[PDB]
Amino acid sequence: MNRFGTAQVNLNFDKNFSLKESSLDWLAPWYDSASFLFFSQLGIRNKDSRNTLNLGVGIRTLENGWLYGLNTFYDNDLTGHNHRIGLGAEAWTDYLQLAANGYFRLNGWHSSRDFSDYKERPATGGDLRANAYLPALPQLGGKLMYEQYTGERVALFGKDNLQRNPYAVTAGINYTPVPLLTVGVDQRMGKSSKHETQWNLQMNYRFGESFQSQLSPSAVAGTRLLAESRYNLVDRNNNIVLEYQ
Numbered sequence: 001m002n003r004f005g006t007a008q009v010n011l012n013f014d015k016n017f018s019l020k021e022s023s024l025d026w027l028a029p030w031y032d033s034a035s036f037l038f039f040s041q042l043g044i045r046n047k048d049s050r051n052t053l054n055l056g057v058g059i060r061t062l063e064n065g066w067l068y069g070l071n072t073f074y075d076n077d078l079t080g081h082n083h084r085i086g087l088g089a090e091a092w093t094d095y096l097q098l099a100a101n102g103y104f105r106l107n108g109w110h111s112s113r114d115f116s117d118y119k120e121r122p123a124t125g126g127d128l129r130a131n132a133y134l135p136a137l138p139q140l141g142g143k144l145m146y147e148q149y150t151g152e153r154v155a156l157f158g159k160d161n162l163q164r165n166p167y168a169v170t171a172g173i174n175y176t177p178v179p180l181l182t183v184g185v186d187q188r189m190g191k192s193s194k195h196e197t198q199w200n201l202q203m204n205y206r207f208g209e210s211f212q213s214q215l216s217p218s219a220v221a222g223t224r225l226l227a228e229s230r231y232n233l234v235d236r237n238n239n240i241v242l243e244y245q
């Protein structure tokens with residue numbers, strides 16, 4: 001063929017550009033037709049002294065200028081042994097990617113490496129995401145999300161900021177001078193003025209595309225069209241939000 005999937009590196013930094021998370025995600029198309037794509041996604045990441053493996057499958061179908069997808073994931077925090085299943089839906093067009101995700105616990109309360117004296121487990125929740133790019137300047141991207149989790153003492157803004165049934169709204173900007181490279185900044189905000197600024201450095205390798213074209217400013221417009229976005233990584237939270245008791 002022509003396109004054999006995507007590998008993505010992410011490095012995320014806090015306000016002080018202190019590195020908070022590193023990840024590698026890989027999407028592989030197993031069956032690729034002009035209307036139906038079946039893929040696998042495999043991910044690994046390190047965050048707050050924890051390593052998580054994500055394993056998912058997904059389908060995408062194309063109709064009348066739109067792409068509709070479904071996906072599911074098994075997420076596995078290997079460090080604290082926390083297990084989660086996820087479901088995801090997609091509705092994407094040229095320049096515009098919408099997504100909804102649900103996250104569900106598979107295991108129950110067990111000892112926590114974070115708090116001697118209390119238990120942890122996956123918090124149930126979901127999110128709504130939108131990624132948009134400017135047709136007049138497709139290197140410029142915007143992002144909005146809403147997240148909500150259920151629980152008494154949920155670590156949405158980290159373990160030193162546990163909250164009851166918290167939410168977060170994110171607003172972010174990002175710039176992709178070249179298909180290989182994206183830089184972004186996000187603001188995340190919740191109840192009681194909880195707040196987070198996050199900086200993202202992202203690399204994208206598109207298997208089968210020439211290296212030169214992935215270093216071309218003029219190739220970026222094309223990355224925002226369905227013929228290519230059909231190969232994008234699933235837009236979800238690959239980290240397991242824990243709650244505590």
Ligand SMILES: CCCCCCCC/C=C\CCCCCCCC(=O)OC[C@@H](O)CO
Nearest residue numbers: 061068069089091099100128129130144145
């Ligand atoms: C922060 C604001 C963002 C709000 C985002 C709004 C959320 C809507 C997102 C997704 C809607 C789901 C679309 C529908 C997804 C279903 C996919 C499907 O039907 O697969 C077909 C296969 O059978 C192929 O043969």
Ligand SMILES: CCCCCCCC/C=C\CCCCCCCC(=O)OC[C@H](O)CO
Nearest residue numbers: 003004005028029030040041042055056057
């Ligand atoms: C319905 C199927 C159920 C089966 C459940 C297993 C899915 C587990 C997910 C990720 C693990 C590893 C991913 C497996 C490697 C992908 C294969 C591959 O790379 O295909 C060749 C490439 O696409 C040619 O261009």
Ligand SMILES: CCCCCCCC/C=C\CCCCCCCC(=O)OC[C@H](O)CO
Nearest residue numbers: 004028029030031032038039040042055056
């Ligand atoms: C014995 C060890 C068991 C390993 C269990 C590990 C858990 C999940 C890993 C892999 C899922 C299987 C991957 C199967 C390969 C998918 C086939 C494919 O990707 O398509 C080929 C190509 O596109 C056709 O032209």
Ligand SMILES: CCCCCCCC/C=C\CCCCCCCC(=O)OC[C@H](O)CO
Nearest residue numbers: 009019020021022023024044045046047048
């Ligand atoms: C070589 C390519 C450059 C990109 C890098 C690929 C991303 C690595 C992915 C998962 C790390 C899981 C392995 C565990 C290794 C130690 C942790 C680490 O890599 O960094 C510290 C953490 O990110 C700060 O909190």
Ligand SMILES: CCCCCCCC/C=C\CCCCCCCC(=O)OC[C@H](O)CO
Nearest residue numbers: 042053055076077078079080081082083107
């Ligand atoms: C073919 C290409 C290669 C693709 C390769 C993909 C295969 C990865 C599959 C499984 C790893 C899952 C590891 C299991 C670790 C579980 C540790 C845990 O968290 O469980 C403890 C439990 O809570 C105590 O009751």
Ligand SMILES: CCCCCCCC/C=C\CCCCCCCC(=O)OC[C@H](O)CO
Nearest residue numbers: 063064065066067068091092098128145146
């Ligand atoms: C709790 C606060 C949440 C804040 C968020 C509230 C915004 C919800 C609004 C719209 C959702 C859009 C749903 C996506 C609809 C799919 C579009 C589509 O498929 O249209 C095809 C086209 O119209 C063929 O002619």
Ligand SMILES: CCCCCCCC/C=C\CCCCCCCC(=O)OC[C@H](O)CO
Nearest residue numbers: 087102103104105108109124125150152245
């Ligand atoms: C969109 C379709 C997929 C939806 C899938 C639905 C599965 C999860 C539904 C609700 C979870 C929240 C319900 C409340 C259950 C948690 C209470 C509990 O079991 O434990 C609390 C106590 O602290 C410990 O003993």
Ligand SMILES: CCCCCCCC/C=C\CCCCCCCC(=O)OC[C@H](O)CO
Nearest residue numbers: 065093094095096132133134135140141142
């Ligand atoms: C600081 C600024 C950063 C933010 C930068 C992003 C701003 C969003 C711009 C354009 C969204 C792209 C719009 C493309 C929508 C295509 C919809 C479509 O294909 O369908 C037609 C629709 O049904 C009608 O009848």
Ligand SMILES: CCCCCCCC/C=C\CCCCCCCC(=O)OC[C@H](O)CO
Nearest residue numbers: 007008009024180203204205209210211212
């Ligand atoms: C490739 C392994 C996946 C790692 C995931 C990291 C994400 C993107 C990282 C680096 C871009 C590659 C830097 C230079 C090496 C590119 C390999 C290459 O150029 O491939 C030959 C191609 O045929 C030429 O036309």
